Amino acid sequence: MGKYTKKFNEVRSTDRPLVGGKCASLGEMVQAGLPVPDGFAVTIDAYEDFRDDSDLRAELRSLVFGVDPDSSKSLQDAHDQAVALVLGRNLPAAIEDEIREAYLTLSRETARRRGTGDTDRIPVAVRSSSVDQQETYLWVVGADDVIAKVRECWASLYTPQAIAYRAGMSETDAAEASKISVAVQLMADADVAGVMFTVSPRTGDRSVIAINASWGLGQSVVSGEVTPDEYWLSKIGPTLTSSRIASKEHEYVPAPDGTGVIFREVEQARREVSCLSDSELMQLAEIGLRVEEHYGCPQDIEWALEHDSDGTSRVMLLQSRPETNWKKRK
C-alpha cells in the first residue's frame, strides 16, 4: 500500500491534506533545492487509521467533549487517560511495519552515504506536524524508539491546553484539528558546522555573506564553546574577500551510541587549520543566496557540512530566520 510514510524528496506543497504544514514546508524547500536533513513524513493516515482500528476515536472524542474546560483537574484527568490510550492501544501492523521500514531505509541509505556502520541505529529527530504546538524529540535511535516517539507526538494532541481548545469546536472541526503528521529526519553528523548571515550583523551591509565555522557539531559555534573561523564574501561573484582562522580547541560530536553529544578536544593538527575549503565556502555562499531569495529577507542560517564516503561535500540547512538586526531596525 505505502500509505503511511512519504520520503521528503517526494513531498510537494500540495500535500498539506496528508502531511500537514511543517512537512509540506520541508517538501517545497527540497523542491526549491534547499538541502534540509533527509527523512520521511508519517502521514495523517497513520494516526487516523490507528484511532479507527478500534473504538479509540469515539473514546478520545468523548474524553475531549467530556471535559470541564474551566476545571484544571478536568483537563489533567482527560489528558491522562487520553495519553494512556494513545501510547497503549495496539498499533496496526501495516502502520508499524511501514514506519519501521521507512526508518530502516533512511538508516541504511545514510550509513552507505556517510560510509558509516550499517547498524540500523541512525540517530534521528521526530517532530509533530499539525494539518494547519510543536513536539520535538532529538537523538532518537533504533526502530523501536522511532515508533515510541511517533506515538508521543500523537499523544501531544492531548495536552490540557490542546484538549480545552477542541472541547470548544464543532465535532467536524475537532476531528479535523485532531489530524497530525510526524517528521522523522536525520540528526546532523557534521564534519564542520556553524552559522551564515546574508547581511553583515555589524553594518547591515546586504552585499556580503559572513560564515562562522568550526569542526564537528554546530553546537560549539552556536553556544560559543569554541572560537570559530570567520569568512567574508561579497555577493557579487561571489568573491571571497576575507578570512580569519582561529585555534579551534574543542568540538561536539555524536555520542557513539547516538543518544547525545560529547564535548571533546580538537587534536593539535586540526586546531589551526582552515575548516572549510575554498570550494566549500562557495557551496555555502550559494546556499545562502538561495535561502535568502526563497524567504525574501536577509537570513541567519544554521548549516552543517558532511563529507560523503565518495568525497563530495554535502551542506545541510538546519535552521533559518530573518537576521535579527536587519529585522530589529526594520
Author numbering: 1 to 132, 143 to 340
The authors write:
Crystals of HpeI diffracted to 1.8 Å resolution, and the structure was solved by molecular replacement using an HpeI AlphaFold model (AF-A0A520FAS4-F1-v4), with the N- and C-terminal lobes as separate search models. The ATP-binding site is located at the interface between the N- and C-terminal α/β lobes. The motif comprises β-strands 3 and 4 and their joining loop (V124-V150) located in the N-terminal α/β lobe. The motif from all phenolic substrate kinases more closely resembles PEP synthase than PPDK. Notably, residues 133 to 142 comprising the conserved loop could not be modeled in our HpeI structure and are presumably disordered. Another notable feature of the HpeI structure is that it is in a more open conformation than many characterized grasp domains. The ATP grasp domains from RPH and PPDK structures were shown to undergo a hinge-like ATP-dependent conformational change between the two α/β lobes to enclose ATP. Given that HpeI was crystallized in the absence of ATP, the crystals likely represent the open conformation, and it would similarly undergo ATP-dependent closure upon binding, though no crystals of the nucleotide-bound form were obtained. More particularly, the structural data indicate that HpeI corresponds to the ATP-grasp domain of RPH while HpeH harbors the swivel and RIF-binding domains of RPH.
Catabolism in GD02 is initiated by a two-component kinase, HpeHI, which catalyzes the ATP-dependent phosphorylation of AV or HAP to 4-phospho-AV or 4-phosphoacetophenone (PAP), respectively. The structural data indicate that HpeHI is a two-component homolog of RPH, a single component enzyme involved in antibiotic resistance.
